[PDB]
């Protein structure tokens, strides 16, 4: 069918020493599930997990579409030489009453050359399983 992708932007705000995650959307989501009419939420991971701040995050569920339009910004404190030894990584679950997450697959971005300036980059992200 293809591979799963999400478009993802990433921004440093060194006034604040703080890093957004800007979550956008899923495209090509046909390929990623068998089943149909389930709901679909992100799950971020800011790794290693520093136990200082957080490092989970999850999306709010929305219903599946093989496009999927999300929007949701995750803020994380950090300063810029800590971020740059983070690797991001971001799976796309499916979610019902149970709160259990299945989460079937996802990629991993290295932080190691995010800029500091404040202008964000926003690329395309293959999946994996
Ligand atoms: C209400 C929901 C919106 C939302 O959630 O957004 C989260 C906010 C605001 O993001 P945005 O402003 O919507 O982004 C704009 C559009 O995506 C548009 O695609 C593009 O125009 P074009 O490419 O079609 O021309 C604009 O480019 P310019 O040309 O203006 O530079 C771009 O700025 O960002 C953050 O949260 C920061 C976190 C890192």
Known sequence: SGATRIQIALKYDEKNKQFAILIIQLSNLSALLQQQDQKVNIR????????????????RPLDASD???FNEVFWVS??????????????????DRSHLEECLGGAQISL???????????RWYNLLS
């Open 44 to 59: 971020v991971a800011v790794l290693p997990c520093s136990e200082s701040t957080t490092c989970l995050f999850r999306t």
């Open 67 to 69: 496009t999927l339009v």
């Open 78 to 95: 950090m300063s810029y030489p800590a971020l740059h030894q983070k690797t991001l990584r971001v799976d796309v679950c499916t979610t």
């Open 112 to 122: 190691a050359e995010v800029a500091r300036s404040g202008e964000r980059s926003t």
